[PDB]
Ligand binder design. Structure first.
Ligand SMILES: *[C@@H]1O[C@H](CO)[C@@H](O)[C@H](O)[C@H]1NC(C)=O
Lengths: 111, 194, 127
């Protein structure tokens, strides 16, 4: 029973510039370990979604080093150091703490 | 000479329903069973066929760890030659059982304020189970003589029901985790020792 | 290579049952907590259910609680999702995803990281 929001709702990006997206929660996800449990996922349109970032900022396996994750408490952000022609679709942030899990409304990135 | 991965069994955050009891097979390790013998939480330590102190100087080919969560007063059914919903329909031990049963009351995590829906116990079944037989099928129990076609109704029952484990619940109904150790001997070398 | 194949889709009337099955091939199936995630038609994702490494379920979604029933089988490497009280609002794709962190590899056990996704089925309901 945690509700999350994202911003901006939909932003147009042009290839060759960074972009920043913010995910906000209701209860701070700082666990006893000191780890944030938020995850960032990209659901490309027409294809199954794929993982981008797990454990707040630990970069997932097999993705390039062009993505960055930061934030804590109740606010987290994802920044694309450089955007290209293959970075269009939908982005979600999902909690991994108080079950059940939840997925944000989704940010729509286009050209 | 690695240590048997027992903690993952007893200290698991989630255990399986008694109807879908989980089975961890153990192999190629040295089990310090004394580790769990030194803990008061595991009060209920009913073992049949062997003494715990003695078997720490013994060896078996395989060991099986079956775990699930039951009600407080329903622990007795976890014994050879018993009857009831659990022993007839969920987890039956054979008459000739040569292992142990460990059970303790997990009221801190296995219980919810809003009542839990993560636990089911098979209530109806046409036939009693065989020793260590597992049934996760969820077909309607046809008790009447008109087919049920997959919808609950008169003489048509959905078998699994959910335990309402709650913090204020009575001890007999408070939650309980059970770990069942079986030890087998075969022509294969004994890979489990202490 | 890792493969997650699901089956069970097909038009069924409201007020019946279904039994979706997801089969995994290419890894030790008992060191990964599976999840079942719906995908409404032309909408965002929505978590439905999951199961940990020891066949212990981790709760269902708030609006679905009461009917769905998950089950696992490590012997056949098979995860199943019995569905009851099917209603028109339950038409969507369904993916079965797997966790990332192997258990006891580093506080508590892991459950995050739906990394590998099979191509979901197309369950639908109508009369
Ligand atoms: C489980 O945790 C307890 C308490 O920390 C510990 O003593 C034990 O070695 C662990 N393993 C078992 C026996 O489950």
């Amino acid at each position: 029973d945690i509700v999350m929001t994202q911003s901006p709702l939909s932003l147009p990006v042009t290839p060759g510039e960074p972009a920043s997206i913010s995910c906000r929660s209701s209860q701070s996800l700082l666990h006893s370990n000191g780890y944030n449990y938020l995850d960032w996922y990209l659901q490309k349109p027409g294809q199954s979604p794929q993982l981008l970032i797990y454990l707040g900022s630990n970069r997932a396996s097999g993705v390039p080093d062009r993505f960055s994750g930061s934030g804590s408490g109740t606010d987290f952000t994802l920044k694309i150091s450089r955007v290209e022609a293959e970075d269009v679709g939908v982005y979600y942030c999902m909690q991994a703490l108080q079950t059940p899990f939840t997925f944000g409304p989704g940010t729509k990135v286009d050209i | 000479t690695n240590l048997c991965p027992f903690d993952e069994v007893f200290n698991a955050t989630r255990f399986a329903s008694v109807y879908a009891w989980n089975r961890k097979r153990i192999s190629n390790c040295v089990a310090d069973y004394s580790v769990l013998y030194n803990l008061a939480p595991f009060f209920t330590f009913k073992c049949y066929g062997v003494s715990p102190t003695k078997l720490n100087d013994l060896c078996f080919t395989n060991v099986y760890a079956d775990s699930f969560v039951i009600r407080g007063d329903e622990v007795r059914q976890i014994a050879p030659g018993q009857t009831g919903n659990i022993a007839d329909y969920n987890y039956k031990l054979p008459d000739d059982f040569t292992g142990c049963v460990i059970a303790w009351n997990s009221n801190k995590l296995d219980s919810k304020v809003s009542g839990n829906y993560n636990y089911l116990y098979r209530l109806f079944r046409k036939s009693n189970l065989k020793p260590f037989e597992r049934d996760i099928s969820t077909e309607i129990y046809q008790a009447g003589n008109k087919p049920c076609n997959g919808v609950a109704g008169f003489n048509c029952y959905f078998p699994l029901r959910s335990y309402s484990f709650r913090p204020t619940y009575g001890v007999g109904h408070q939650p309980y985790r059970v770990v069942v150790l079986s030890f087998e001997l075969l022509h294969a070398p004994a890979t489990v020792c202490g | 290579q890792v493969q997650l194949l699901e089956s069970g889709g097909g038009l069924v009337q409201p007020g019946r049952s279904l039994r979706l099955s997801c089969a995994a091939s290419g890894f030790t199936f008992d060191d990964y907590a599976m999840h079942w995630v719906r995908q409404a038609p032309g909408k965002g994702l929505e978590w439905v259910s999951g199961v940990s490494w020891n066949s212990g379920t981790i709760g269902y979604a708030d609006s679905v609680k009461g009917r769905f029933t998950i089950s696992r089988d490590n012997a056949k490497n098979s995860l199943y999702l019995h569905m009851r009280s099917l209603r028109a609002e339950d038409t969507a794709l369904y993916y079965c995803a797997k966790a990332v962190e192997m258990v006891r590899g580093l506080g508590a056990d892991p459950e995050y990281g739906m990394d590998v996704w099979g191509q979901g089925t197309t369950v639908t309901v109508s009369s």
